[PDB]
Design a protein around this ligand. Structure first.
Ligand SMILES: Nc1ncnc2c1ncn2[C@@H]1O[C@H](COP(=O)(O)OP(=O)(O)OP(=O)(O)O)[C@@H](O)[C@H]1O
Ligand SMILES: Nc1ncnc2c1ncn2[C@@H]1O[C@H](COP(=O)(O)OP(=O)(O)OP(=O)(O)O)[C@@H](O)[C@H]1O
Ligand code: NA
Lengths: 438, 468
């Protein structure tokens, strides 16, 4: 059943419907769908209006019979029949209500979050993404790519010894690379703790019902493994953003003078159904990887979320600067944005052997898209004419395997890989991991 | 289906079969079963004897036809196979010299009939092989001579060694401490999201978790172990070489959606063992020592509502594991077992945790283990010793199942009277959530939990995590 889509409230006002139509056109999506959603919703509201009315009339029938029969009268027989009929009508109204919600929500799958005014308008990323900032020597060239380096270290196995055990794109890390992996986890966690984030270690399973509130329906198809055996069926998490968002379901923050900031720490599991033969090379694109994630829950007011988005990307930049990895920050074009995001920044690191900018980090302001889906409310209650929801953002701090790949290319020498200065105290003071002699 | 059970070769020797029957009796397990396993294997070897005879006869048929056609011999009167010929190949006594008396039409029919026999024999072979290993599910590794002989743990285990003050008492148990810290959520906010026994850790407890992972890994690196980060999925075929059928029912989650069905690992021992499948170490002058690092996933199907509370027994937890592959000769694996339990002891001493070491009795040993030591840490608020660590010598039980051979591997070697396999051992260094529970009880004060000295540099120098 459950699925994550845009708030219905914005559709029920002429000005809001026009905001959504405009955002649809700017995303290269269908604006005509907004009318279809308003109509389905108008029918749905009608069923709810009749249901609330008829329920009140069911008590009228009950109280009437209670007063009449206490008065010792032999119309009661009619009132009883009318109670059964209204209960029948309410039952019929509910089945119709259900069908209409299903139709509405399925139409809404095609409606994205309202674009920020700064999002570039383009359908294609190569031409369409706008470069915001660059850091370091982004034209640097180096000898060996990350796959060759990790193979020459003797510290990564992606051969049939592993894939015949664990399937395609599975890998073993050994020795110095595991030390580096752990160094990055711990350094990444500390980096965020120092910036006011609360560490958060989630369950790696979510139930279907809950996963449906924080995942787009296409993610079930392309990205989420199903887990079974123990009670209800579950899904492995693709990112700690899922359980962190789900953790706020049904919550209500009367105010958030300070944001909630979490440093999500987890293994991430991705089926990568789309990537038939994209990579297959190294640990750059794998089904299982550690990631440290920024997650922010904040007030929906005064565009505070937009300020946090800037802080979050700046945080990921400062992290990569600390590692000395060259990069560019790009503002993702409207055609490439997922539905939840109102704006997205990617930090794409320069891979000097490979000769390419490759995404290490994405940071998104999802405003009230997830929040309305998980029902994470904000402010005072209606009983204020609008229901307010918290804003939520999420952004990579460090995706560990891709960052390891970038470090290997950028810090290679003839003898091995130099460990970035900041990571050394997190791996026993090791200055370099060395190639197998030949 | 794929299955981890004892090696067959020792069953086919009278002295070997008796050693196995004796070990079974000493485990309070079934010896009578060995006769049933020998019989199932006898049936199996018969299908191989016939298969090899018939495969050779098929080649003789082809060569005979070739020679007859070359000489322009007439094809013959009939393709009908003499009943004695059918009887002979069904019994494995048909000789090539007799086959060569047949005409071309007969040789052709016989080649087809022998091919059908070879196909029927492959199916018989596998129903017999499944029936056999299933009977083998109940047969344990040969006990080391020092294993206490008893059925029940609570009385049969032998306390070997103790460390620290194991009678001190403390006020709050680990559940109450982690609650008062505000850093562990096991409420419906979490369980309605992720199911029973699910948890969220926050704040200082995540810092402590990471500190333990990194300190544990460093602890083993300093002792010559190679870090090993595995895939957390194993496919059915491979999982069955390193697990018994009962673990599929009680312990292993199934994962699907992409490729064939896989299982989540319950310990890094599984993928590390599997990684050695089909290997052949001609010599291991030094052992291979691995420091396994992984999340472990356990259904806990048996422990339905056994513990329930806190993070002591959960479905998902980090663990750092010792895994050793070594020579099967000169009782070397027994020396490694002693070093491994000592390493886990020194780790706990370094954390300042009191404990006892117990030698696990014969009746309570799992099948793969020839001997097992557990380290049970003292939980002063619970008032009990609770298992933190197990270390076992599985000698060649996993290695035979995964086919990890030892010894010279040279051309010209025929049917080897004794195939040798490596020995494998495994032992917990640190199960992270249980160690956190132990630390919380032992290091509690009025204001919170004091961080053990050795972990402080691994969590930004923090000396204490404070109650809300
Ligand atoms: N299959 C993978 N293997 C290793 N790292 C990955 C993989 N998928 C994503 N990452 C890392 O996680 C970061 C965040 O990825 P995200 O959750 O945004 O998924 P995505 O499909 O890349 O979506 P987006 O288009 O927003 O980046 C990426 O920038 C990358 O560093
Ligand atoms: N469900 C669990 N939750 C948290 N920690 C666990 C769990 N199961 C095992 N552990 C930890 O892992 C360690 C090793 O566990 P092991 O794999 O040996 O499983 P076991 O069946 O509980 O123990 P044994 O080996 O004695 O049968 C235990 O000593 C304990 O510290
Ligand atoms: Na340049």
């Amino acid at each position: 059943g459950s699925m994550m889509v845009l708030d219905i409230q914005l559709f029920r006002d002429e000005t809001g419907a026009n905001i959504i139509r405009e955002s649809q056109r700017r995303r290269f999506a269908d604006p005509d769908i907004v009318d279809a959603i308003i109509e389905a919703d108008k029918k749905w509201r009608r069923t709810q209006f009749l249901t609330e009315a008829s329920k009140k009339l069911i008590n009228i029938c009950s109280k009437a019979v209670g007063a009449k029969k206490k008065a010792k009268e032999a119309c009661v027989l009619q009132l009883k029949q009318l109670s059964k009929d209204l209960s029948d009508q309410v039952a019929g109204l509910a089945k119709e209500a259900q069908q209409l919600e299903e139709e509405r929500d399925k139409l809404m799958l095609n409606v994205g979050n309202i674009l920020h005014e700064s999002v570039p308008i383009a359908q294609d990323e190569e031409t369409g993404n706008t470069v915001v900032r660059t850091f370091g020597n982004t034209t640097k060239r180096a000898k060996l790519n990350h796959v060759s380096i990790m193979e020459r270290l003797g510290m990564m196995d992606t051969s049939k010894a592993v894939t015949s055990m664990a399937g395609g794109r599975s890998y073993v890390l050994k020795g110095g690379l595991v030390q580096l992996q752990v160094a990055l986890v711990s350094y990444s966690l500390d980096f965020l703790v120092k910036r006011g984030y609360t560490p958060f270690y989630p369950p790696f399973f979510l139930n279907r019902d809950v996963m449906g509130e924080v995942a787009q329906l296409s993610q079930f198809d392309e990205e989420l493994y199903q887990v079974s055996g123990d009670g209800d069926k579950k899904y492995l998490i693709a990112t700690s953003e899922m359980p962190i968002a789900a953790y706020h379901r049904g919550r209500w923050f009367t105010e958030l003078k300070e944001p909630l900031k979490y440093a999500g720490m987890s293994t991430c599991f991705r089926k990568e159904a789309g990537a038939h033969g994209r990579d297959t090379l190294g640990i750059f694109r794998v089904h299982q990887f550690d990631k440290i994630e920024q997650f922010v829950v904040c007030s929906p007011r005064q565009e505070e979320s937009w300020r946090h988005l800037e802080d979050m990307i700046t945080t990921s930049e400062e992290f990569n600067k600390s590692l000395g990895l060259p990069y560019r920050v790009v503002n993702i074009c409207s055609g490439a944005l997922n539905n939840a995001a109102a704006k997205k920044y990617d930090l794409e690191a320069w891979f000097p052997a490979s000769g390419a900018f490759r995404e290490l980090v994405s940071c998104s302001n999802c405003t009230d898209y997830q929040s309305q889906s998980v029902n994470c409310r904000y402010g005072p209650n209606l009983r204020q004419n609008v229901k307010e929801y918290c804003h939520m953002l999420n952004g990579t701090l460090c995706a560990i395997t891709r960052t390891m790949c970038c470090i290997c290319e950028n810090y290679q020498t003839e003898e091995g890989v130099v460990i970035p200065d900041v990571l050394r105290p997190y791996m026993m003071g090791i200055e370099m991991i060395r190639f197998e002699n030949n």
